[PDB]
Amino acid sequence: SYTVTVATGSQEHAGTDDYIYLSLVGSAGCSEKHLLDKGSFERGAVDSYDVTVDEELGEIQLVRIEKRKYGSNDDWYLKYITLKTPHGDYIEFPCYRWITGDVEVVLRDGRAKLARDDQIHILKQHRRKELETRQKQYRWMEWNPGFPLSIDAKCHKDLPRDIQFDSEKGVDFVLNYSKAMENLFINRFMHMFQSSWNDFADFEKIFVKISNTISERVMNHWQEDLMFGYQFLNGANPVLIRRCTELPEKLPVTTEMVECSLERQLSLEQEVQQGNIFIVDFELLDGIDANKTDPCTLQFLAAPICLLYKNLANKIVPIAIQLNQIPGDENPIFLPSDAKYDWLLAKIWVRSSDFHVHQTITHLLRTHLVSEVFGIAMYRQLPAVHPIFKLLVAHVRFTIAINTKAREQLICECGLFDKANATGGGGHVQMVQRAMKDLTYASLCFPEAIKARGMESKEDIPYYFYRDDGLLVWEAIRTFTAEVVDIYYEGDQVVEEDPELQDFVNDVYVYGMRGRKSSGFPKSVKSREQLSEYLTVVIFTASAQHAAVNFGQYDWASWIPNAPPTMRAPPPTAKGVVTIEQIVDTLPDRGRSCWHLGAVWALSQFQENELFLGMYPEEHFIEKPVKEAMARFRKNLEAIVSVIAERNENLQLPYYYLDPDRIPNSVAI
């Protein structure tokens, strides 16, 4: 007799009352269909049955599951099935899928296999038919012109059940944003799009009720040059600043203009040569359409150039700001020596520009859309039994779902994104298109990305915590993927000859990245080392990178003056005119402020049962060597947690974002 154990998921709607039939596919043969229990498989339940067979089957190759309607359709989430055979063998069959009753589900045992491992028809047939089904199920589509290709579905409910959120409205922008505004006691402002705050105190009264540790600090110090500069290294969008190797001709700033800022008795030009000058250049925003979806509110964008300076205390501070790209009499170079509110407003404009690039490029394009490309390629080209599928499936969990929700509710035409954002209404689509033209594989390789911006020296630039922690997590993942690769690939030739791996890599290149020559993405992978790097790009982007740029949004943007989602007047074209009252009226109205707060709060939340880096409750892998690799991965992450903990004890303002205990496995929000 076989002992057959069936485990139902613990999600809300995991249970089913329908009929479940099970049969066993063996070498010598097959078993008859067996109806199970005629009862209910409740959520969280494990059901085991005693099954005697009418024939000796030999070694079990596959388990088939079939769900038939009893009443109405009732989704069933199947975690796994295990067998205890007459011969005393214990076999596990990982599933972790929604069974809708539409189709039969056929499972391999959990041992990871390359195509070259399968030689008998039973297995080859199953493998090929699985991929045929996958490629009918998961298809590419161009959502907007020039975008990376994404899933062929126009709304969340159109997705295959297997890649939907566990609930339909569980993670939902419309609902989550509105609940957020309720929790922040700002519900009453949700429509006040024509009302400015009376003054900073007016917003402050609203804000102190809902501030956390960091945003309260921002409230108290946002006007300081030190805190302005700090954010380029350790804020929510610490990926733009680079070391200037020569002053741009489009920024005609002189030593005499910034002499008061310089502390080494050197000319500006010589400070550049010493590597003490840094720059943030928002040329990408130049020519982007401003939000016009509200005809009663004019909104405005800039494209600033910010020149920064590493002072004697090794802090990077702003010394000059030109708010538009082309120099001229109506495009002043503002300085910390200007009138109080001239310099402040200039900084605010830079902060606003930083927020635009963060939301659409750093966050949306470079973590969300990228991760969806890897995910779709994975589903299309890698069967469940493949070791790379088992490795990566955990790191694209809910990614296609959250992205489809966004395209359905947030960033579509007339979506929520259009309410508060100056780039809303088409501008954000333009940014993605233009950034895509310059998106490279190298720029996703963390250590290379840091060096490409000239920010790698810990000696010259000691307070770049995003860099430090990022490098540690990157290496931890690189070590882990390398061990996994070495377990299932005996050499480089085996990697090169893996046809499914090549098709995976090829799908990312041709469809995901549109077959763009300058993308730098591999067309194929032909060594264990190259494969390891590739897998690290996928996992790091999906986990660490997304965490670093996502979960600090409320911390840094909740005090709106430090991250305005829009501006209601053009950049000042002259000095000595701006007043504090004008600034208040330029900042977002109460309405757009409300939606802004709601959004950045909602996006910064962890789920109650969030899965963090290295947590793999879904045992797709069942073999001991890889389990031990995972164990070492976890131990390495713990060591990093301690490193970061000790580093943060000596900081004015702890940088927590890349603490592995706080890094989710995947892009899920």
Nearer to Fe ion, 60 or 236 (CB): 236
Our finding on whether 550 is near Fe ion (CB under 5 A) is yes
Instruction: Answer yes or no: are the C-beta atoms of 406 and 500 closer than 8 Å.
Output: no
Q: How far is the CB of 549 from Fe ion (least distance, A)?
A: 8
- Taking the least distance from each CB to Fe ion, the nearer of 150 and 502 is 150
CB of 548 to Fe ion, least distance (A): 11
Sheet arrangement for strand 305-310: 242-243, 277-281, 305-310, 316-322, 333-334
Query: CB of residue 368 vs Fe ion: minimum separation in angstroms?
Result: 6
Rounded CA gap, 81 and 40, in Å?
16
Minimum distance from CB of 554 to Fe ion (Å)? 13
Nearest to 35 by CA among 73, 78, 68: 68
Q: Buried b vs exposed e over 321-346: b needs ≥16 C-beta within 10 Å?
A: bbbbbebeeeebbbbbebeebbbbbb
Binding to Fe ion, residues 3-62 (CB under 5 A): none
Stretch 496-535: interaction string toward Fe ion, x if CB under 5 A:
----------------------------------------
Produce one character per residue of 444-456: b if its CB has 16 or more CB atoms within 10 Å, e if not.
Answer: bbbeebbeebbbb
* Closer residue to Fe ion (CB): 173 or 616: 173
Structure tokens at 493: 């030739």
Q: How far is the CB of 669 from Fe ion (least distance, A)?
A: 5
Query: In whole angstroms, how far apart are CA 340 and each of 347, 425, 585?
Result: 11, 34, 17
Binding segment (CB under 5 A) for Fe ion, from list 83-91, 137-145, 426-434, 542-550: 542-550
Interacting span for Fe ion (CB under 5 A) from 67-75, 96-104, 317-325, 547-555: 547-555
CB of 406 to Fe ion, least distance (A): 9
Question: Smallest gap, in angstroms, from Cβ of residue 550 to Fe ion?
Answer: 4
- Which CB sits closer to Fe ion, 80 or 446? 446
CA distances from 134 to 94, 117, 131, 402, 572 (A): 17, 21, 5, 20, 55
502 vs 550 by CB, closer to Fe ion: 550
The footprint of Fe ion on residues 589-618 (CB under 5 A) is: none
Please tell me whether residue 399 binds Fe ion under the rule CB under 5 A.
no
Residue number of the CB atom closest to Fe ion? 550
Residue type, 90: Y
By beta-carbon proximity to Fe ion, the closer residue of 368 and 386 is: 368
Distance CA 270, CA 141 (A): 51
Stretch of 33-41, 87-95, 176-184, 545-553 lying at the interface with Fe ion (CB under 5 A): 545-553
Q: What is the DSSP letter of 564?
A: -
Shortest approach of Fe ion to residue 190 CB, angstroms?
23
Least distance from C-beta 226 to Fe ion, angstroms?
29
Question: Minimum Å distance from CB 364 to Fe ion?
Answer: 8
Question: Burial code of 187-199, b = ≥16 C-beta within 10 A, e = fewer?
Answer: eebbeebeebbee
CA distances from 391 to 55, 84, 125, 513 (A): 37, 26, 23, 22
Query: Please, which residue, 583 or 669, has the CB nearer to Fe ion?
Result: 669
Between residues 325 and 399, which has the closer beta carbon with respect to Fe ion? 399
Q: Are 173 and 406 in contact (CB under 8 A)?
A: yes
Which two three-digit tokens encode residue 176? 């989550």
Residue 322 or residue 550: which is nearer to Fe ion going by CB? Answer: 550
Backbone angles phi, psi at 505, to 5 degrees: -60, -40
Min dist CB 551 to Fe ion, Å, is: 9
Select from 114-122, 241-249, 390-398, 544-552 the region that touches Fe ion (CB under 5 A). 544-552
Question: How many Cα atoms within 13 Å fall on the side-chain side of residue 127?
Answer: 21
Q: Least distance from C-beta 214 to Fe ion, angstroms?
A: 19
- DSSP-derived secondary structure for 444-499: GSHHHHHHHTT---TTT-TT-HHHHHHHHHHHHHHHHHHHHHHHH-SSHHHHHT-H
Are 8 and 38 a contacting pair, CB within 8 Å? no
List beta partners, residue 35. 21
Q: Find out whether 69 and 100 touch, Cβ atoms under 8 Å.
A: no
Which lies closer to Fe ion via its Cβ, residue 550 or residue 665?
550
Stretch that binds Fe ion, among 175-183, 261-269, 337-345, 550-558 (CB under 5 A): 550-558
**According to the binding rule CB under 5 A, does residue 299 interact with Fe ion?**
no
**Spatial distance between the Cα atoms of 190 and 598, rounded to a whole number of angstroms:** 10
CB neighbourhood size of 53 (10 A) = 18
- Nearest-approach distance from CB 509 to Fe ion, in angstroms: 24
- The alpha carbons of the chain give a radius of gyration, in whole angstroms, of 27
Site for Fe ion in 241-260 (CB under 5 A): none
**Hunting for tokens 């085991």 — which residue is that?**
48
Which window, 283-291, 313-321, 482-490, 548-556, contacts Fe ion (CB under 5 A)?
548-556
Neighbours of 512 (CB within 10 A): 23
Stretch that binds Fe ion, among 436-444, 515-523, 543-551, 610-618 (CB under 5 A): 543-551
> Which residue, 371 or 519, has its beta carbon nearer to Fe ion?
371
Cβ proximity to Fe ion: between 227 and 667 the closer is 667
Stretch that binds Fe ion, among 41-49, 60-68, 429-437, 549-557 (CB under 5 A): 549-557
Task: Give me the amino acid identity at 207.
Answer: F
Task: Kindly state the smallest distance separating residue 143's Cβ from Fe ion, in Å.
Answer: 17
552 or 614: whose CB is closer to Fe ion? 552
Q: Which is nearer to Fe ion, 351 or 405 (CB)?
A: 405
Instruction: For Fe ion, give the closer residue by CB, 82 or 550.
Output: 550
Tell me how far, at minimum, the Cβ of 367 lies from Fe ion, in Å.
Answer: 6
Indicate the residue among 550 and 566 with the shorter CB distance to Fe ion.
550
Total residues at the site for Fe ion (CB under 5 A)? Answer: 1
For 19, phi then psi, to 5°, come to: -80, 140
At closest approach, how far in Å is the CB of 233 from Fe ion? 21
Tokens encoding 548:
């670093």
Distance CA 430, CA 434 (A): 6
Residue 457: both structure tokens together: 């020296």
What residues line the site for Fe ion (CB under 5 A)?
550
